[PDB]
Design a binder for this molecule. Structure first.
Ligand SMILES: [Cl-]
Ligand SMILES: [Cl-]
Ligand SMILES: [Cl-]
Ligand SMILES: [Cl-]
Ligand SMILES: [Cl-]
Ligand SMILES: [Cl-]
Ligand SMILES: [Cl-]
Ligand SMILES: [Cl-]
Length: 484
């Protein structure tokens, strides 16, 4: 039954299984500034945190995401004959997984893939982004019609996200469409605008009841963060915690546990890419991710707040988003508080004085080489007269705080715009990456060089600078000279 093949594919949304969770949510994810991997895997500083991962670590994401999406996508496509809600969901789920992988490594095979064949040619990034928008539009057309009939009973049997409600999936799909549009908006401003405006007309998420969570954690009924955190190999990141400490942010107790290393209490994150080789036992009593504290908590996929912040940015760009930037900014902040059951958004949004906090690492002796001066001075209260760069940093900083824990949002927005100002490693261990800009992408995998050699070598020439490097920019990322 085709609907049953969707269940495996659905692991791309949140990656609940403990190793999927580590690979996607707790490794390179530290480049988004919210989580820190506290382990070194006997590699010392030759790890993601210092921009010089092993081949095995680098290649994990490809294997994980490809493993969930294929061959199930083609099996569904064939069984359904490219029609119906189950096919629409297979398309949406493939796009979700592959937009993540494209946002990691750049070119991927997509348009030219055929059922069971390894040697697929790569699409360049323009081609795969456009192809993914096309498939997503097809899914949207199907879901929009399906939604008019009420909850879909085929989809209900297997859908832990929305229990078959195609109206919720339609909002999810349009919000993804808008995320994608914003992501490619630097390199293709007019194509992006068109897609974003379509997405807004289609209908994006508007309330907390619209947010997507993997409610069963992939049928495991316990989340992967709690497992990784228990090892321990993941803690709260110095960067997000420091921004939130500076803001006296009331979401702190919903996001993190207080450190218990010393009697001081308070929230203290771990510097990713620390002065000393990261050791699990050293950081065991620093702030943990709240979601790790109760294994039954469902891993998040996408929050209603993100749709508001995407529209705020679109409004800053001069796009027609159904509202102005201020309105969407404040909406986003209030949705984020609401999502986590936190009070006090009014007085938070009135804060014109508080600035992002500096980071000190005083819990363990000899750690002051981890201390960091926050390069942001952005305040919370909306200022109609601020310059463009300040309005953007304000939007993207609150967006980044709101979309938590999200492995990619921070790193993607930083690579695209320079905001939020994610704390870099103390040093780079890669000759092609500097701490100013960090790691820019993951590389193509060893398995592809070995088994799909001619096509992966061709894909190298599709990269911005023709080099399969950690420091090579993706098509949509801001380049060294500020252009796209
Ligand atoms: Cl394991
Ligand atoms: Cl370790
Ligand atoms: Cl396949
Ligand atoms: Cl159809
Ligand atoms: Cl039905
Ligand atoms: Cl364009
Ligand atoms: Cl628990
Ligand atoms: Cl490299």
């Amino acid at each position: 039954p085709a609907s049953n093949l969707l269940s495996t594919m659905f692991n791309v949304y949140a990656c609940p299984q403990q190793n999927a969770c580590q690979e996607i949510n707790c490794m390179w994810a530290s480049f988004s500034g919210q989580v820190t991997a506290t382990a070194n895997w006997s590699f010392g500083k030759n790890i993601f945190a210092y921009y010089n991962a092993s081949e095995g670590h680098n290649d994990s994401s490809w294997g994980r995401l490809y493993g969930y999406i294929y061959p199930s996508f083609f099996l569904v496509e064939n069984s359904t004959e490219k029609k119906g809600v189950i096919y629409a969901m297979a398309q949406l789920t493939r796009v979700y997984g592959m937009q993540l992988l494209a946002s990691l490594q750049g070119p991927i095979p997509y348009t030219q893939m055929k059922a069971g064949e390894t040697e697929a040619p790569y699409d360049n990034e323009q081609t795969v982004w456009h192809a993914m928008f096309d498939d997503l539009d097809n899914a949207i057309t199907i879901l929009k019609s399906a939604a008019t009939f009420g909850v879909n009973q085929d989809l209900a049997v297997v859908d832990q996200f929305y229990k078959g409600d195609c109206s919720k999936w339609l909002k999810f799909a349009n919000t993804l469409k808008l995320r994608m549009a914003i992501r490619i908006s630097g390199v293709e401003p007019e194509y992006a605008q068109t897609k974003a405006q379509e997405a807004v007309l289609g209908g994006v998420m508007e309330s907390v009841g619209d947010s997507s969570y993997d409610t069963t954690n992939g049928g495991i009924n316990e989340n992967g963060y709690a497992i990784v955190s228990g090892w321990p190999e993941v803690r709260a990141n110095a960067c997000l915690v420091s921004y939130m400490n500076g803001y006296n942010d009331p979401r702190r107790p919903a996001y993190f546990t207080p450190q218990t290393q010393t009697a001081a209490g308070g929230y203290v994150g771990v510097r990713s890419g620390s002065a000393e080789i990261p050791e699990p036992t050293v950081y065991a009593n620093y702030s943990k991710l709240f979601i790790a504290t109760d294994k039954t908590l469902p891993q998040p996929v996408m929050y209603a707040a993100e749709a508001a912040f995407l529209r705020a940015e679109g409004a800053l760009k001069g796009w027609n988003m159904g509202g102005d930037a201020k309105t969407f900014y404040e909406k986003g902040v209030r949705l984020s508080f609401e999502e986590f059951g936190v009070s006090g958004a009014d007085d938070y949004l009135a804060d014109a004085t508080s600035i992002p906090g500096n980071y000190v690492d005083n819990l363990i002796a000899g750690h002051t080489g981890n201390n960091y001066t926050n390069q942001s001075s952005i305040t919370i209260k909306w200022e109609d007269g601020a310059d463009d760069a300040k309005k953007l940093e304000r939007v993207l900083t609150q967006k980044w705080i709101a979309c938590y824990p999200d492995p990619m949002n921070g790193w993607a927005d930083f690579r695209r715009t320079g905001y939020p100002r994610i704390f870099p490693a103390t040093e780079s261990m890669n000759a092609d990456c500097n701490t100013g800009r960090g790691q820019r992408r993951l590389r193509f995998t060893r398995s592809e060089y070995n088994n799909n050699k001619a096509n992966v070598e061709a894909a190298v020439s599709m990269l911005s600078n023709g080099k399969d490097s950690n420091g090579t920019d993706l098509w949509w990322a801001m380049k060294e000279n500020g252009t796209y």
